[PDB]
Ligand binder design. Sequence first.
Ligand SMILES: Nc1ncnc2c1ncn2[C@@H]1O[C@H](COP(=O)(O)OP(=O)(O)OC[C@H]2O[C@H](O)[C@H](O)[C@@H]2O)[C@@H](O)[C@H]1O
Ligand SMILES: Nc1ncnc2c1ncn2[C@@H]1O[C@H](COP(=O)(O)OP(=O)(O)OC[C@H]2O[C@H](O)[C@H](O)[C@@H]2O)[C@@H](O)[C@H]1O
Lengths: 153, 153
Amino acid sequence: ERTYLYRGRILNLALEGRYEIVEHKPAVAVIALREGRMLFVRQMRPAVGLAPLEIPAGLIEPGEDPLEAARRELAEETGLSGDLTYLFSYFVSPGFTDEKTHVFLAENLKEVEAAIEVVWMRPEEALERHQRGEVEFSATGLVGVLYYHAFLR
Amino acid sequence: ERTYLYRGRILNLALEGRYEIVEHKPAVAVIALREGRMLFVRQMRPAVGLAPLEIPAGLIEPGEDPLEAARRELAEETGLSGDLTYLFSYFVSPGFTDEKTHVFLAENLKEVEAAIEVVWMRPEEALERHQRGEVEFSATGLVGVLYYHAFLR
Ligand SMILES: Nc1ncnc2c1ncn2[C@@H]1O[C@H](COP(=O)(O)OP(=O)(O)OC[C@H]2O[C@H](O)[C@H](O)[C@@H]2O)[C@@H](O)[C@H]1O
Ligand SMILES: Nc1ncnc2c1ncn2[C@@H]1O[C@H](COP(=O)(O)OP(=O)(O)OC[C@H]2O[C@H](O)[C@H](O)[C@@H]2O)[C@@H](O)[C@H]1O
């Protein structure tokens, strides 16, 4: 059983026996390749004080399933729509939070609409920039880069 | 500036303007392959109520750098030691936490020592089991699987 220390906007903090638990809405992330470039985004993230390289990602809000949330954040963050395929999911850090991320591939991208910086970048270059200390990754950004190298070359 | 709502054992909860921020110690994770099997671990994770497929992972404690923490958790969780190479890092979920994970590759594993279940499993099978809904991934488990498919075949 959980006792709640804080009920917030995008998280709750609970204690469960000796365990500190952060409840958090699920998330989605979209991997998209065009002309050899992957679709990254960057935004200032106050939790870390910097703008890591991410792929388009967002929270699943009331009413939505993961596919719908993925289509929405792709459009809102980048102005694009595409044909989305579910790939896999992961718990971001299951030792303390229940946040689960559902990852999609987007193909056949179309601009549907003309704080978030869109960064098209070859994944090989993202990985080299990271290795040289020039940019940080989020989990979603790293998953995109690794998925590309595994399956999209 | 941050105001603290909770100072805990493995996290602090702060507000920063409108932002809810979870401070958390950094983590490490180790990717290890032997005879075509990757070294996974499973443990009950109360935050999610299940035991996802992870790779050996742990927190960096006072006094330690990432390499040292990685060697320690590999030994404590699996009884193994190896030659460790730094690969890359990622922020697990930078929209709300500062947790950063440093990922290593381990080679030339040796048993140094005879709650945590050690699960050697071919990564192709881990990914198929996940696709069929049979097991969940942590971020570290998924990163291990993707890294293998990208670079270790
Ligand atoms: N929710 C918690 N609340 C209280 N203490 C905890 C909790 N979980 C663990 N402990 C204590 O904290 C001690 C040290 O934890 P270590 O074992 O090095 O790490 P890890 O395997 O848990 O987490 C490693 C990563 O894997 C996952 O993605 C995680 O979220 C991390 O990102 C433990 O001995 C526990 O006593
Ligand atoms: N720390 C926070 N505290 C308060 N509200 C917040 C915070 N961060 C965002 N908001 C609000 O929450 C609203 C909805 O958030 P959406 O934009 O769909 O998601 P995302 O891109 O932030 O996070 C997506 C994932 O990427 C990362 O890995 C994250 O940690 C997630 O795992 C926002 O409009 C903000 O107003």
